Design an enzyme around this catalytic site. Structure first.
Site, PDB file in Angstrom:
ATOM      1  N   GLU A  24      28.099  83.758  55.503  1.00  0.00           N
ATOM      2  CA  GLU A  24      28.033  83.974  56.974  1.00  0.00           C
ATOM      3  C   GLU A  24      28.662  85.338  57.283  1.00  0.00           C
ATOM      4  CB  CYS A  26      24.755  89.133  55.571  1.00  0.00           C
ATOM      5  SG  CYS A  26      25.716  90.665  55.452  1.00  0.00           S
ATOM      6  CE1 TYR A 101      26.850  96.461  47.002  1.00  0.00           C
ATOM      7  CE2 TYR A 101      27.486  98.767  46.899  1.00  0.00           C
ATOM      8  CZ  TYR A 101      27.833  97.428  46.914  1.00  0.00           C
ATOM      9  OH  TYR A 101      29.141  97.052  46.838  1.00  0.00           O
ATOM     10  CG  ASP A 147      20.060  91.217  67.096  1.00  0.00           C
ATOM     11  OD1 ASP A 147      20.743  91.665  68.044  1.00  0.00           O
ATOM     12  OD2 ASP A 147      20.521  90.493  66.186  1.00  0.00           O
ATOM     13  N   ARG A 151      26.035  96.512  64.344  1.00  0.00           N
ATOM     14  CA  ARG A 151      26.200  95.431  63.327  1.00  0.00           C
ATOM     15  C   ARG A 151      24.939  95.317  62.447  1.00  0.00           C
ATOM     16  CG  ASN A 152      21.637  93.522  63.296  1.00  0.00           C
ATOM     17  OD1 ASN A 152      22.219  92.845  62.450  1.00  0.00           O
ATOM     18  ND2 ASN A 152      21.223  93.025  64.447  1.00  0.00           N
ATOM     19  CG  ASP A 165      19.435  91.777  59.435  1.00  0.00           C
ATOM     20  OD1 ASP A 165      19.470  92.015  58.206  1.00  0.00           O
ATOM     21  OD2 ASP A 165      20.389  91.282  60.073  1.00  0.00           O
TER      22      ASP A 165
HETATM   23  C1  LIG Z   1      26.081  92.058  56.579  1.00  0.00           C
HETATM   24  C2  LIG Z   1      26.332  93.536  56.647  1.00  0.00           C
HETATM   25  C3  LIG Z   1      27.514  93.976  55.814  1.00  0.00           C
HETATM   26  O1  LIG Z   1      28.587  94.311  56.310  1.00  0.00           O
HETATM   27  N1  LIG Z   1      27.276  93.969  54.482  1.00  0.00           N
HETATM   28  C4  LIG Z   1      28.195  94.292  53.457  1.00  0.00           C
HETATM   29  C5  LIG Z   1      29.487  93.720  53.503  1.00  0.00           C
HETATM   30  C6  LIG Z   1      30.397  93.986  52.518  1.00  0.00           C
HETATM   31  C7  LIG Z   1      30.052  94.802  51.460  1.00  0.00           C
HETATM   32  C8  LIG Z   1      28.793  95.375  51.365  1.00  0.00           C
HETATM   33  C9  LIG Z   1      28.473  96.259  50.188  1.00  0.00           C
HETATM   34  C10 LIG Z   1      27.843  95.113  52.359  1.00  0.00           C
HETATM   35  N2  LIG Z   1      26.574  95.732  52.240  1.00  0.00           N
HETATM   36  C11 LIG Z   1      25.305  95.232  52.266  1.00  0.00           C
HETATM   37  N3  LIG Z   1      25.110  94.010  52.807  1.00  0.00           N
HETATM   38  C12 LIG Z   1      23.855  93.554  52.833  1.00  0.00           C
HETATM   39  C13 LIG Z   1      22.804  94.309  52.345  1.00  0.00           C
HETATM   40  O2  LIG Z   1      21.502  93.866  52.355  1.00  0.00           O
HETATM   41  C14 LIG Z   1      21.138  92.763  53.198  1.00  0.00           C
HETATM   42  C15 LIG Z   1      19.655  92.778  53.461  1.00  0.00           C
HETATM   43  C16 LIG Z   1      18.764  92.014  52.702  1.00  0.00           C
HETATM   44 CL1  LIG Z   1      19.353  91.040  51.393  1.00  0.00          CL
HETATM   45  C17 LIG Z   1      17.395  92.026  52.959  1.00  0.00           C
HETATM   46  O3  LIG Z   1      16.604  91.256  52.156  1.00  0.00           O
HETATM   47  C18 LIG Z   1      15.294  90.907  52.593  1.00  0.00           C
HETATM   48  C19 LIG Z   1      16.902  92.816  53.983  1.00  0.00           C
HETATM   49  C20 LIG Z   1      17.759  93.586  54.754  1.00  0.00           C
HETATM   50  O4  LIG Z   1      17.328  94.369  55.788  1.00  0.00           O
HETATM   51  C21 LIG Z   1      15.997  94.882  55.753  1.00  0.00           C
HETATM   52  C22 LIG Z   1      19.127  93.551  54.491  1.00  0.00           C
HETATM   53 CL2  LIG Z   1      20.195  94.502  55.467  1.00  0.00          CL
HETATM   54  C23 LIG Z   1      23.083  95.553  51.810  1.00  0.00           C
HETATM   55  N4  LIG Z   1      24.330  96.029  51.774  1.00  0.00           N
END
Ligand SMILES: *CCC(=O)Nc1cccc(C)c1Nc1ncc(OCc2c(Cl)c(OC)cc(OC)c2Cl)cn1
Length: 280
Positions: A24, A26, A101, A147, A151-152, A165
């Protein structure tokens, strides 16, 4: 269930080393991981990646939601200012969708963490410029975000802004109240357009220049609806020029057809990034 393979996107399951869950905070079950040999030319290279997968208790809607998201990211294609699809594991086990990442987390935490107990004016306008270039690209591929908020947006190790997202009452989430980012037509008529994202971009600009503040200070949620209908907008933050505040107010035009387009915003912000100094 059985999925078709696209050899362009398919990564062998033993090339992915799963790491710490995020949980929770993400959307969906997301796991930090390492992909080995993601470029065929450099098969000994390890790349940090995020992975989306299904919970143990996942319905048929949840599976199809994760497949539609993955497929929508193929349609849209690659931009440096969006979170890009890198690959998938579709075959000999459960669905993994593998994305870029972003080591420094979301834009709100990044801005908040760099508050004085740091960022130049140029960094903050360059941030808004990058979020605008991402949204301009998403708009061109007919993608409505619905949205858009700090945060996004995520931030990479090289401080690149990546929209997140994009392929997806007034109660809290994270603790966020989404209604504060919604255009009136979205709030009142359940209408979402590219122009409604330009409204949310206005609120994101406000977020950037207050280093991650809560929109509509001192306004209870109960009486926010009445204030918007009355024509109330957020006042100018102090770390902000009249030009940039005029851009916010333009994004917050009551009639969606009179707001600027993301194309128009990128052009203006391109100019302002050049006029803004690294000492200002
Ligand atoms: C939730 C946002 C955040 O603060 N993420 C976070 C928190 C602590 C450390 C790190 C390195 C990160 N980074 C991070 N979080 C999520 C991420 O990818 C998520 C994602 C996915 Cl899995 C996806 O899959 C279909 C599609 C996305 O958007 C198109 C996203 Cl954002 C990457 N880095």
């Amino acid at each position: 269930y059985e999925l078709p393979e696209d050899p362009r996107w398919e990564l062998p399951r033993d090339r992915l080393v799963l790491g710490k869950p995020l949980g929770e905070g993400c959307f969906g079950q997301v796991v930090l991981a390492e992909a080995i040999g993601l470029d065929k030319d450099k098969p000994n290279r390890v790349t940090k990646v995020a992975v989306k997968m299904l919970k143990s208790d996942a319905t048929e809607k949840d599976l199809s939601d994760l497949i539609s998201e993955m497929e929508m990211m193929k349609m849209i294609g690659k931009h440096k200012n969006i979170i890009n699809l890198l690959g998938a594991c579709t075959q000999d086990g459960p669905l993994y969708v593998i994305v870029e990442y972003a080591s420094k987390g979301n834009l709100r935490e990044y801005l908040q963490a760099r508050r004085p107990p740091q960022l130049s004016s140029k960094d903050l306008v360059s941030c808004a410029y990058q979020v605008a270039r991402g949204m301009e690209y998403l708009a061109s591929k007919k993608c409505i975000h619905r949205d858009l908020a700090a945060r996004n947006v995520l931030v990479t190790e090289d401080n690149v802004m990546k929209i997140a997202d994009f392929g997806l009452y007034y109660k809290k989430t994270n603790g966020r109240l989404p209604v504060k980012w919604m255009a009136p037509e979205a709030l009142f008529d359940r209408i979402y357009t590219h122009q409604s994202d330009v409204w949310s971009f206005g609120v994101l600009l406000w977020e950037i220049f207050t280093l991650g503040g809560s929109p509509y200070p001192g306004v209870p949620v109960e009486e926010l609806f009445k204030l918007l209908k009355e024509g109330h907008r957020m006042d100018k933050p102090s770390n902000c020029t009249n030009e940039l505040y005029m851009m916010m107010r333009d994004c917050w035009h009551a009639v969606p057809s009179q707001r600027p387009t993301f194309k128009q915003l990128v052009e203006d912000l391109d100019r302002i990034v050049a006029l803004t100094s690294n000492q200002e």
